[PDB]
Ligand binder design. Sequence first.
Ligand SMILES: OC[C@H]1O[C@@H](O[C@H]2[C@H](O)[C@@H](O)[C@H](O)O[C@@H]2CO)[C@H](O)[C@@H](O)[C@@H]1O
Length: 304
Amino acid sequence: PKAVDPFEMVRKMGMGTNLGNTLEAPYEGSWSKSAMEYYFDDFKAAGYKNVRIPVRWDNHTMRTYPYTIDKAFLDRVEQVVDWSLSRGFVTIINSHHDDWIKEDYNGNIERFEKIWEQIAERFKNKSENLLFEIMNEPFGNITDEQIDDMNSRILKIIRKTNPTRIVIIGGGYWNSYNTLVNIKIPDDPYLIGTFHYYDPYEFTHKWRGTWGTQEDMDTVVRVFDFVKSWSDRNNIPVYFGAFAVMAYADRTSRVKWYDFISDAALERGFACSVWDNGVFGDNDMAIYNRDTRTFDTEILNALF
Ligand SMILES: OC[C@H]1O[C@@H](O[C@H]2[C@H](O)[C@@H](O)[C@H](O)O[C@@H]2CO)[C@H](O)[C@@H](O)[C@@H]1O
């Protein structure tokens, strides 16, 4: 009845990191290096206060009823979660890249439910610091009615075994042109809303040449301020699961951007996780080198 409320958590979560391109890859390791328990020792030393762990269940779950999840895979995900929880991190697991659910919905919603049914069961006794994020990026390729349907039913499933565990549902998205927020939010006291950058017409834009300008900053504060009003009006805390997910004009801009987002976000009381590709050598968007156990100091400095 009296558990931690979403606002207390968001305050607790603070600035964190993503364990990108790992368990959300088709198969763990097929992309960036697999999860090692030292990753978390370093993140803790680094300052991160939360760790989002994307997870694609597609290939560890039967494609046919009863859509059971590999016993082993579940064991694996729990091992990683426990490493994170043991270190005091507010930990977030979800469904990432399980696009099949958007290529149909009437057809795959049950498989999606079974998966969430089994996740909720296995982690039901986990610490309050383990949050369930229904789906990474709900928007796009699916009607609003279906996005709403999905949240209600997965939440309902989760609540049967996790009566007070905080759940994260998309509250909306933003892009250079507009911001979209949800009006219809489920009637539940344990929900956090999450936003990500999304542009349905992305594969059309005549483009610009990546981010970093003053105009972009002006654009984000705009977005952040509206989400803020949304947050206050709906009484639902905000969390930017993966930011700085863009390419930049140069090293100096990139650092500045990481410094900027963190400031604006936390000042408005938002929780957020930086997107960490876990890739160096391309070099993309990785802050922590899983091979050298070293971080891009300048960026960490800009985040804290
Ligand atoms: O889809 C494969 C592609 O994913 C990239 O990460 C995404 C992340 O999955 C998404 O949730 C977030 O909103 O954006 C990031 C980056 O765009 C990953 O960085 C790529 O290497 C990978 O090929």
